[PDB]
Amino acid sequence: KIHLQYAKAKEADGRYKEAVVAYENAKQWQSVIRIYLDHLNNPEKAVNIVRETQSLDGAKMVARFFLQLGDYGSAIQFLVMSKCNNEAFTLAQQHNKMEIYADIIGSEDTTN
Numbered sequence: 001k002i003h004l005q006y007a008k009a010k011e012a013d014g015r016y017k018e019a020v021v022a023y024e025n026a027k028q029w030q031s032v033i034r035i036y037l038d039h040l041n042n043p044e045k046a047v048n049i050v051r052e053t054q055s056l057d058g059a060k061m062v063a064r065f066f067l068q069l070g071d072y073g074s075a076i077q078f079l080v081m082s083k084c085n086n087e088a089f090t091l092a093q094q095h096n097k098m099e100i101y102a103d104i105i106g107s108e109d110t111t112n
Contacts, residue, residue: 001026003021003022003023003026004022004023004026004028004031006022007022007023007026010022016039016040019031019035020032020035020036020045023035027053029046029049029053029055029056029058029059030058032045032046032055033055033058033059033062034058037058037061037062037065041062041065043062043078046058046059046061046062047059047062047079050079050080056083059079059080060079060081060082062079063075063076063078063079063081067091070095073091073092073095073098073101073104073105074101074104076088076105077091077092077101077104077105077107080109083112085111085112086111088105088111089102089105089111092105
């Protein structure tokens with residue numbers, strides 16, 4: 001919580017130097033994602049928490065911004081749509097319909 005205090009303080013400045021530490025130490029994929037996706041935009045940065053700390057829908061912000069390509073149907077599942085059984089399945093249909101991309105989302109945990 002002390003780190004989160006310094007996080008709010010430096011956020012008022014704007015330097016995400018170690019505020020990501022301030023967040024993830026406080027177990028904030030929330031604040032990590034807010035700051036990085038807001039500025040860093042690094043898929044690896046958010047994917048850190050996404051693939052080792054189970055970041056929920058904060059990763060989904062990254063995909064919400066990065067789902068603007070033909071092969072980004074993987075991106076919709078690259079971040080796993082958080083917990084989603086048909087959101088990413090609607091996205092798989094959505095290309096025109098993408099059965100190949102649907103089974104691509106079926107690379108591990110197709111649908112639930």
